[PDB]
Structures are given as structure tokens and as C-alpha cells.
């Protein structure tokens, strides 16, 4: 699980096939809840998926870009292009479902 920033967000996206981007903030409790879940996700799909984390407090223009207004927001990118969105703090199986739809 790596960090993405306003500078390298587009590099990372065009550099990897499948990228799961977690829009989060340090002060958010449902963020903290899915955080260990998303790295089990990272392990499970270690070779076909890159998990990235976007701090919306440090990267407001990136959050503004995709209009991420409420977090635990997870967006799936399939070829630099967004294909799935998960808006709540959710069970691991819900992420697994949308990842495998594009595997
Ligand atoms: Cl690629
Ligand atoms: Cl920014
Ligand atoms: Cl939530
Ligand atoms: Cl459950
Ligand atoms: Cl499990
Ligand atoms: Cl689950």
C-alpha cells in the first residue's frame, strides 16, 4: 500500500493496470476501519493490483478533481481509467467483488 500525491497520481495510474485508490484522512474513523482491510486486499491481489492511498487533507486538488466530498471513498482504475466506486466503510468482500470484475 503506497501513497499517491497530487504530483504522481497520474504517473502511478498510467504505470499500472489495476489501481485501487483510497481517499482518506487521518481524522476519519471509518477510514481507520478499512485501512487494515485494504492491505489484506493488497496481499491477496499482490501481482494484479496496486493499492494506493490519497490523503485528501494534503491533496485537496486531487480530491476536488474526482469530487470526493465524503471519504472512505475508494475508486478503482483499470487502465488509468476509473471503473468502480465504493463510498462507505465496507466489508472486504465488497472490494473483492469489484476488483475481480476487472481481473
Ligand atoms: Cl499499465
Ligand atoms: Cl493538491
Ligand atoms: Cl462509512
Ligand atoms: Cl461480515
Ligand atoms: Cl477473508
Ligand atoms: Cl468480507
Domains, the chain, with CATH or none: 1-103 (3.40.30.10)
Contact 30, 88 (CB under 8 A): yes
Specify the 3-state DSSP secondary structure of 82.
strand
Catalytic entry in 13, 19, 21, 28: 28
What are φ and ψ of residue 58, in 5° steps? -95, -20
Q: How many C-beta atoms lie closer than 10 Å to residue 17's C-beta?
A: 13
Q: How many C-beta atoms lie closer than 10 Å to residue 53's C-beta?
A: 18
Separation of CA 77 and ligand 5 centre (Å): 23
Classify residue 22 as exposed, middle or buried by CB count within 10 Å of its CB (0-12, 13-18, 19+): buried
User: What technique solved it?
Assistant: X-ray
Q: How many C-beta atoms lie closer than 10 Å to residue 34's C-beta?
A: 24
Rounded to an integer, what distance in angstroms lies between the CA atom of residue 36 and that of residue 102? Answer: 22
Write the DSSP symbol of residue 6.
T
Rg of the chain taking only CA atoms, in angstroms = 12
Rounded to an integer, what distance in angstroms lies between the CA atom of residue 29 and that of residue 34? Answer: 9
Catalytic entry in 20, 31, 41, 75: 31
In the sheet with 82-86, reading across from the earlier edge strand, the strands are: 2-3, 50-55, 19-24, 73-77, 82-86
Q: Which residue has the cell 476488483?
A: 99
Spell out a b/e string for 56-76, using b for 16 or more CB atoms within 10 Å of the CB, else e: beebeebbeebebeebbbbbb
Rounded to an integer, what distance in angstroms lies between the CA atom of residue 75 and that of residue 25? Answer: 15
Amino acid at each position: 500500500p503506497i501513497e499517491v500525491t497530487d504530483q504522481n497520481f497520474d504517473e502511478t495510474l498510467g504505470q499500472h493496470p489495476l489501481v485501487l485508490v483510497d481517499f482518506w484522512a487521518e481524522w476519519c474513523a471509518p477510514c481507520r476501519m478499512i485501512a487494515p482491510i485494504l492491505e489484506e486486499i493488497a496481499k491477496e491481489y499482490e501481482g494484479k493490483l496496486l493499492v494506493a492511498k490519497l490523503d485528501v487533507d494534503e491533496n485537496p486538488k486531487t480530491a476536488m478533481r474526482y469530487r470526493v466530498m465524503s471519504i472512505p471513498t475508494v475508486i478503482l482504475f483499470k487502465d488509468g481509467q476509473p471503473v468502480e466506486v465504493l463510498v462507505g466503510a465496507q466489508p472486504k468482500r465488497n472490494y473483492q467483488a469489484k476488483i475481480e470484475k476487472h481481473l
